[PDB]
Amino acid sequence: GIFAFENEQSSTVAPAKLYKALTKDSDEIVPKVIEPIQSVEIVEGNGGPGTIKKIIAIHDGHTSFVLHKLDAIDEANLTYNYSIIGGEGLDESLEKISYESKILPGPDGGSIGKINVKFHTKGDVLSETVRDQAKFKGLGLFKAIEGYVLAHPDY
């Protein structure tokens, strides 16, 4: 199945800066904001669509990873779509989780992060364990990065 959810988060960060942090600079910001993440490594591709990233983490004890694929990016429209396609952290019932993001202009020179998340389930049911984690999964990454940029604009 494919269960889509939409979420929106306002931010005081200027659209282009928030977008940059979420795209171009995420590899380097993420390790600083989510401690278990040691690094984010490009294992395929040269950065545009199709690129695969191995996010190396050590969830208490041993190193593991999660696989991320860039599905599309359009900086001119401040949009970027990526998916979580493998490794630990990806529920057993999911094929992958796809995110389609767009940063829109908000009032007062701030912005709005519209995140459409799609859970591609192996069955016809979205488990309550996942529908109850569609949160951390929905806006988690976004909030972490936005908070960082918010507190470290000159990063």
CA distance 97 to 120: 6
CA distance 111 to 103: 7
Q: At what angle do helices 26-33 and 15-22 cross, to 10 degrees?
A: 80
Residue 82 is part of which domain span? 1-155
Instruction: Say if CB 9 and CB 113 are below 8 A apart.
Output: yes
CA dihedral sign of residues 37, 41, 45, 46: positive
Binding site annotation covers 69? Answer: no
What CATH number does the domain containing 44 carry? 3.30.530.20
Binding site annotation covers 132? Answer: yes
Q: Based on the structure, what is the number of domains in the chain? A: 1
Binding site annotation covers 37? Answer: yes
Binding site annotation covers 137? Answer: no
- Ramachandran sector of residue 109 (left: φ over 0; alpha: ψ -120 to 50; beta: rest): left
Residue carrying the six token digits 């995420």: 26
Binding site annotation covers 27? Answer: yes
DSSP at 13 = S
Residue 68 tokens read as: 């991320």
Binding site annotation covers 124? Answer: no
